[PDB]
Structures are given as C-alpha cells and as structure tokens.
Design a protein around this nucleic acid. Structure first.
Lengths: 55, 182, 135, 327, 147, 55
RNA sequence: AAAACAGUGAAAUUGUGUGUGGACCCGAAUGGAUCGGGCCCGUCUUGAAACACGGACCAAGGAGUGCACAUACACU
C-alpha cells in the first residue's frame, strides 16, 4: 500500500459469497403485464385494485 | 542599455500566442471560432487578443465558471466584459447594473435575469462589432483552485498544515484535523 | 514495358541508380531456422548489435529515409493507385500527370477488357496491362 | 420559413403546409457518433466459458529430481494420457487464462439530455441534400425534400403500393437495394447472419393505416412511429441523413414533440432546444469584414535570405582587400 | 477523449512489463490490506492519516437518522426560493410575501448576507439564529416559529 | 457578400506586395553608393593614423 | 485417451540432377589467387566469450484480465 487514499475497506474475503445478475429483467416485466391482463378479464367490469385510505 | 533591451523582449514573447497549440475538441463549431482568432493574432500585437486565443486552447477544468455577481465585482467600472467560459446565475442577487457580456455560454436562468435588468449577451465571434479599439473592455478569469477537491491536497501530518484527511464519515466516525493552528 | 513519365524523362536514371539496396535482416536469423528475416530490435543486456560495436551490422533509423519528393516513386516515374471498377478510373482524370493505375489481382478476364477499353480513351497508364489477358 | 407540398395517390399536389422548427438546428457529428456507440451495446446477450473447464482431472506435480519440468501431471495407468501436463494455460486440454465470466458489464449508460439532443439533430439532417447524398441514398430524380404523403391513401395491396412509390421518384433507390443481396464474408455466415443488404427508405406514420402492410414486403423499406423514433434507425452505422417518407399527421406532430426555439417542449419534460458557441462553420470569413480590417496592421512581405558560408559565394557578399598599415 | 488505447498494448516485446529487472513483480512484497501500520508502514500513517489509531467520543447504541435530519438556509437566499416570475411581482406590488421554509424542506434559518429586497417579509421556520431575527426585524418583517 | 469581399483583400494585397518590393530595391541601390565613398575615406584615415605614430 | 472431409498439402528431414563453396555474418571487388572488421545467444550481476546456468531440430498452443469502492486527469 502506497500513496494517499481513503483507507480501503472492500468486503470480498468470503469465498462462499453469491452473485445475482439481472438478465431476466425485461422478460419478467412482460410476464407481470400478461398476468394483469388476464386477471382483468376474469372480473371484467370491476377495477383490479381496491380503495385504500389516506394516512 | 542592452540589459533593458533583452528584458523588454522576454516580456513580449511571454504574452504572444505559441502557434503550436490546438484545442482537443472534435466540435467543428468550436474549431471554427479558434481559426478566426488564430488568423487575427498573426496580424496584431494587441495583448487582449493574444490572451483570448491562448485561453481557447486550455482544458475544461482550466475554463472554470463564474457567477453573475462575481463578474460585476471584477468588472471595475467597465462597460463591456469578456470571458472564455460559462456564466451562471447567483440566487443571492436580483437587481444588477446595465452591462454587456461577451462570453462562450450562459445558463437559461442567468440570461433571463440579465435581460430583465437591461443588458446583452453576445458570443465571442461578435467582439469586433461590440468594440472598435478594445479600450473599453475588461478581461476576467476564474480559478480552478476553488474546487472542493483542493481541500485534500498536501499532507495532514505536516506541522501547521491546513489540509483535510480523506476519511470515512458518520455521526461518530471520522478523522479530524489535528496539526493545524487556531 | 519501357515507358517513362515525360516530366522526369531526363532525370529518371540518376534517380534509379541512386536508390539504396540495403537490407536490415534480423540478428542471428542466419544461425537458426526458427527466427525469420523480419526486423525486430535487440533488447538483450549483453547484445553486441544494440551496443553498436564495430563489425556488427547496422540498425534502421530515421537517417536512412529518402527525400520527400523522390519517395514512393515507381521506376517509370509515376506513383500508383489501385483500381477494381470502371468508375475508379474516373477519379484519375485530374491526376494523370503523376499517377498511374494498377488493376487488383482478383478482377477477372471479362471485366479487365472493359477496364482497358476505358483506360485507352481517357488516356491513363495501366501498369499490369498484359496481366492474365495474354492468351 | 418555407411551405412544403403534400402528395396525393395519383401524384397531384394542391395543399401546402409550414415546416416544423426542429429543422433549423445545427448538426454535431461528434454527439451523433457517441450516442450511437453506447446505445448499440444495449442489445447484447452474455457469453462465457463453462465455470470449471480444464480443471476436471486428478493431477499433481512430480517435483524436482526426475529431469522434468515441474508442471502438474495426470495420475493414470494403461493409457497414453499418463504423465501428460494437466491444468496450466500453456498445456493441451488445460484451463484458459482469466476465464470469461458472466459478471462483465454488458450495457452502457448515456444521459437522457444527450439522447434527446442527438435525436433532434438527427431528424434535422434528414432535410439537408448534402448529408442524404453523402450516406449513399440516390435522389437525382426526386423533385424536392422532404416528402410528405397525404392521408386518404386507401391502398391495401402491394401491387398498387409500388406504383405510388415509383411516382415519387424512388425507383433507382429501390433497385439499388434489390440488386445488393450477397453472402457475408467470414464466420458470421455460420452464426445466423448469412445475408447482407443495403439500407433504404424509412416510413414514419403516427396513425394506424393500411399502407403500412402494403409497403412492408418491398426490400429495404423500414417502418417506425414518430413518438418512439430511434437513433439506430435515424443514423445507421453512426452516419446521419437517412431518407424519410413522412405521413401528413406525423410531420405536424414534430412541433408538439420538439417544441419551438428557446421554449420548453410539453411532450418532453425538462427539454429545450439550444444554441451553439457559434452560429455557422463559416465564421473564419469574418476576417474580411470592414470592422476587422480597420483593427489590424499592414504586413511586411520582404524577408531575409538564408545564411551562406561557402568560400566563393561568401566572397561576392564580402570582398576582402589587404592593407599594409601596422597600427 | 471518449476512447484511447491502453498501455499494456505498447509493452509487447519489452521483457519486464515495466516493473524492473532487479525489483521484479512478486506477489505481495509489503503485506496484505492496510496492515503493518504501527510497524513498517508507520511513515505513511504519520504523514497522511495521523488520527487513525485512537478511540474518541460519546456512544449511543442505537440512533435514528429521521429524528435528527435537518437542512439550513441563509437570509440572503430567502427571496430565491420563489420562482423568478413570482419574485418580479412582489418586488413592485404593495402586498407582503409569506414564505414557509417547511415547503422546500428547510427547517433552520441562518444570518448570512443581506436580504435581496429591502421590503417586509413573513418567514416561517422551526428555528432562527439571533443574527437572522435582527435582520428580518430591521426591514419590518416578522419571524414565526412553527412545528 | 463576404465571398465577394474576400476578392478585394487579395487584390489590395498584391498591389501592396509589388509596392514594397520596389521601395526595397531603391534602399539597396542607395546603400551601395554610400558604401563606396565611405570605404575610400576609412582606408585613407588608417594611413593618416599610422603617420601620427611615426612622428 | 486418441481418431472430422477417401479436399488443399507448409516446415523439420531424405534421394537424384545441376551449380557454388570448405562454419557463418557485415563492408568492397576480380578472368583469377581474396583483402578489412567481427568470440554465443537469452538471463541474474560491480563485472560474462567464459572452466556460471537454460537451449539437438521444425510446426502449432503459450503469460497484466474481469467486477466492487474511493481517486487525479482528458472529453460531454
């Protein structure tokens, strides 16, 4: 270690650590859209969401 | 006799444009403007023109910005002011004197304020129309030393040093200045 | 082919006889077959060529570069341009005083005939004129 | 500014329209290129080698004293594989240096303000003849730019659709695309990228119409909506000035989308159309103006000769004569 | 510039990759992490980080950020909170503006500079400095404390 | 308009170049005549200075 | 473990024929004897032609990379 820096503190020591990637993000968005649409048919005239209070 | 002649030559050569410098931007509108000033320099000795041409070649960090009130503070009673940089609004001020600014760029909120109080913004291509003999102009400059990152330059473990340590910070955590004077 | 640029006709032989025939072979390419002839600069701590002892060969450098006027000039006194279409010759129409054309190797017989016919009427020198089309 | 003529099915023109304000904006080929580079990287799929390839076998070093290099070697018997060199990157069947890995950063960010500005000046370039010709679209036969097709196009069949496009002068452009088809050079021809074609006209619509499915099978024709017009379609390969067929509704919408000079767009919140540091590329010509010519000073053309020191040449510049005096 | 070639590509053909022939490039010649700091690295610490090896201050085992979070404004900036079109109305008009700092997420008022326009103003906040109060009262304005 | 003004500059400068050139030759010719007379003077004053010492 | 097309068919290495030399390189030449200069590369080292170590020969493979966190510079 040489020169002037903010002293390190990077937590990568643990060999059992898992990584999570997000390559599925656009596809899972499309599935959530298609589930709402079909749910909306099952109860056609009625809104999909209920009324809620203000706090 | 000779010693004076020599020094007066050095002083002159220290002002004039170098002619082996060029701006790094790939912007063709910026490179157009430089070409004009370059062709003026090789046909004149006037110090204001030489200063302007040298400043167009400096980096973004060297072209540090100024706020409207600081221009007026440095204008020292002149009517026209010139600035190779961008003019920003000062939220602390509302009324200003009537003034003409020749500069590179201006922010939306600054331009409105300048106009409401009476006054004009012109781009640097128009300088020669705004002024006939460059006697009524002031030239103004910012300072890159005022960046917040300059507080960390140097060593905090020197005696009498005013510099700040690079540190983690929280409600309790953080390294202090301990070798300064108060 | 025996042709010459008319602007240099009385000078071309002086120029040609003046060109160097020096070669800069890689050090020890004569000793082992696994080292090719292509130049690489020696970087050893002990190396006799890098240290410029008398009796070792010479190294490349800027001093050997030819005068700016003579450089790139073919022995017939022209510079060369590559062509592969009829529409390429159209570029040379202003430059035919100093430049000549060389048809690319992959252009086939049927097309070459069309290039040469156009070259004749425009007045452009083609240096591969015989080419494959001798038969 | 100018008016522009609308074109009906039969090629007649009668009604006319003003031109949107976006078309007066100057063009920055630096920013168009930068934006193209970043956005083009957002469509990639990840690739990597298998997570422990090259490391399967039971291997150990023999250590010194055996007259062999101390690489790990394969433990086996009965096969020629016994004693061969195992795990390292310099070994046949070993593991590669720094195996490629899924955690790499595939996409790239670009500021929303730059994306908006780049698309605005790409739209502008679609109406300068120098740029359109420069991309390689051929427009010798086209009467005027831009083209604006009317509504009340009642076309439903490709047969009648082509007749319309021919009447606008596009024949040579379309032919240039059809004749272009060729098989790609290199390994890409094995990986589902077999044929390459030249780019042609883009059609831009805003309102749903039958004309869209009448023109689409013609090679090199491309279609997009004005409200979601992309820089990949407007500046292919990062060079600007694609030829565009506007629909009459779409052309009027450009005023709501980009607004007016030194105003704020209602459709794009927080965005306004700006000013360059100089108005034109020609500003070097201001030197010849009266105001400048009064300012400067009269040049000296007379210049000194280079120093010469040869005996004979020097003797004609300085003729020396002896003297007898001894003072 | 937006893109540039790397240094590694120029070092092809040069033996040591720029680490030296005598010194070389070994695995960890100085130790791992920020260790050694009272020993062989004492000179780095005493030059750049002198207040590292210490314990200091009062301790609360749990703290809540929301209960202590605040943001501060100076008197010279009060008129600046209004929009520029609004500023230009109240400058000439006979009426007095009523500015509530809570609406912009400010809770404390400090005494820096002079007021932009020398006419009365009503300022609502949670706390004022002694200098701020005197300056606002000087122009015939009023300070109103509120939650 | 400026493309036309560019021509007036080129014309004006050619006149000025021819003018300055003619003024230069006259100086060069003038200088040659002064130099002839002066060399005859100085070669004689050396001769005088020498006799002063002999005396 | 090895082993694709009954394609193309490099180098190391071998036989036959024709030429030029007696380890070979650089400079300069003859009809013709040759003249002058040159110790074996890579590497640690105050110091290598070394009685310091690695190298029989040819092809193909073969070593500053990716992510996180602060940072100075250039560009928007």
């Amino acid at each position: 270690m040489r020169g002037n820096q903010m002293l390190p503190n990077n937590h990568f020591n643990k060999g059992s650590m898992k990584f999570k990637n997000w390559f599925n993000q656009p596809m899972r968005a499309l599935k959530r859209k298609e589930v709402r649409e079909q749910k909306s048919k099952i109860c056609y005239p009625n809104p999909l969401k209920k009324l809620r209070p203000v706090v | 006799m000779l010693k004076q002649k020599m020094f007066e030559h050095y002083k002159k050569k220290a002002i004039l444009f170098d002619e082996s410098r060029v701006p790094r931007t790939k912007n063709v509108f910026y490179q157009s403007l430089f070409s004009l000033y370059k062709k003026v320099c090789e046909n004149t000795e006037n110090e204001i023109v030489h200063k302007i041409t040298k400043r167009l070649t400096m980096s973004r960090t060297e072209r540090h910005p100024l706020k409207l009130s600081n221009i007026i503070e440095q204008a020292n009673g002149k009517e026209i002011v010139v600035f190779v940089g961008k003019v920003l609004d000062d939220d602390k001020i509302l009324e200003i004197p009537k003034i003409t600014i020749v500069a590179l760029k201006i922010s939306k909120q600054a331009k409105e304020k300048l106009t409401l109080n009476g006054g004009e913004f012109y781009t640097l291509d128009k300088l020669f129309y705004i002024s006939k003999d460059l006697k009524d102009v002031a030239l103004v400059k910012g300072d890159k030393n005022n960046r917040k990152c300059t507080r960390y330059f140097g060593a905090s473990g020197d005696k009498g040093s005013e510099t700040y340590p690079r540190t983690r910070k929280g409600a309790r955590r953080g390294e202090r200045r301990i070798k300064n004077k108060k | 082919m025996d042709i010459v640029n008319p602007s240099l006709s009385k000078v071309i032989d002086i120029i040609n006889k003046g060109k160097s025939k020096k070669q800069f072979k890689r050090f020890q390419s004569w000793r082992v077959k696994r080292v090719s002839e292509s130049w690489r600069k020696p970087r050893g701590i002990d190396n006799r060529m890098r240290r410029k002892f008398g009796g070792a060969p010479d190294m490349p450098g800027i001093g050997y570069k030819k005068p700016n006027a003579i450089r790139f000039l073919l022995p017939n006194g022209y510079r060369k341009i590559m062509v592969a279409c009829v529409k390429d010759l159209e570029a040379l129409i202003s430059l035919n005083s100093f430049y000549c054309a060389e048809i690319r190797h992959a252009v086939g017989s049927k097309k070459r005939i069309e290039i040469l016919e156009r070259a004749e009427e425009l007045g452009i020198l083609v240096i591969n004129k015989e080419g494959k089309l001798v038969k | 500014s100018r008016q522009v003529n609308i074109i009906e099915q039969d090629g007649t023109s009668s009604r006319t329209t003003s031109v949107p304000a976006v078309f007066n904006l100057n063009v920055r080929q630096d920013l168009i290129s930068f934006t193209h580079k970043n956005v083009a990287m957002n469509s990639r799929q990840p690739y990597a080698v298998k997570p422990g390839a090259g490391m399967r076998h039971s291997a150990k070093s023999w250590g010194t004293g055996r007259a062999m290099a101390r690489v790990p070697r394969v433990r086996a018997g009965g096969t020629r594989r016994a004693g061969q060199g195992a795990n390292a990157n310099f070994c046949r069947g070993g593991r590669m240096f720094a195996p490629t890995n899924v955690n790499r950063r595939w996409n790239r960010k670009t500021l929303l303000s730059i994306r908006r500005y780049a698309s605005a000046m790409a739209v502008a370039a679609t109406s300068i003849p120098a740029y359109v010709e420069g991309r390689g679209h051929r427009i010798e036969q086209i009467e005027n730019i831009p083209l604006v097709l009317s509504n009340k196009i009642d076309t439903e069949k490709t047969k009648e659709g082509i007749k319309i496009l021919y009447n606008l002068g596009l024949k040579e452009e379309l032919d240039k695309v059809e004749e272009s088809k060729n098989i790609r050079a290199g390994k890409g021809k094995w990986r589902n990228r077999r044929y390459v074609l030249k780019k042609g006209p883009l059609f831009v619509y805003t309102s749903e119409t039958s004309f869209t499915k009448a023109i689409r099978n013609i090679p090199g024709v491309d279609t997009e909506r004005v409200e979601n017009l992309s820089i990949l379609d407007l500046a292919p390969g990062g060079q600007a000035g694609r030829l565009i067929i506007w629909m009459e509704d779409a052309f009027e919408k450009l005023t709501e989308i980009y607004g007016e000079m030194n105003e704020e767009s209602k459709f794009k919140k927080g965005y306004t159309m700006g000013m360059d540091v100089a108005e034109n590329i020609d500003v070097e010509n201001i030197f010849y103006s009266d105001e400048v010519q009064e300012f400067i000073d009269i040049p000296n053309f007379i210049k000194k000769d280079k120093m010469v020191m040869e005996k004979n040449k020097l003797a004609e510049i300085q003729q020396y004569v002896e003297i007898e005096e001894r003072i | 510039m937006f893109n540039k070639k790397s240094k590694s590509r120029k070092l092809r053909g040069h033996v040591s990759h720029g680490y030296g022939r005598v010194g070389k490039h070994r695995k960890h010649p100085a130790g791992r992490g920020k260790s050694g700091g009272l020993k062989h690295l004492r000179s780095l610490f005493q030059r750049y980080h002198p207040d590292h090896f210490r314990k200091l201050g009062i301790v609360m085992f749990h703290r809540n950020k929301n209960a202590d979070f605040t943001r501060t404004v100076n008197v010279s900036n009060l008129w600046g909170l209004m929009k520029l079109e609004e500023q230009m109305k109240f400058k000439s008009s006979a009426e007095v503006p009523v500015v509530d700092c809570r609406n912009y997420g400010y809770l404390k008022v400090l005494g820096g500079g002079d007021l932009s326009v020398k006419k009365p103003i009503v300022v609502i906040a949670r706390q004022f400095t002694k200098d701020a109060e005197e300056k606002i009262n000087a122009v015939g304005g009023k300070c109103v404390v509120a939650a | 308009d400026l493309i036309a003004k560019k021509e007036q500059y080129n014309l004006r400068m050619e006149e000025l170049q021819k003018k300055q050139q003619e003024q230069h030759l006259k100086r060069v010719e003038e200088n040659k005549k002064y130099a002839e007379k002066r060399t005859v003077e100085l070669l004689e004053t050396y001769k005088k200075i020498a006799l002063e010492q002999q005396l």
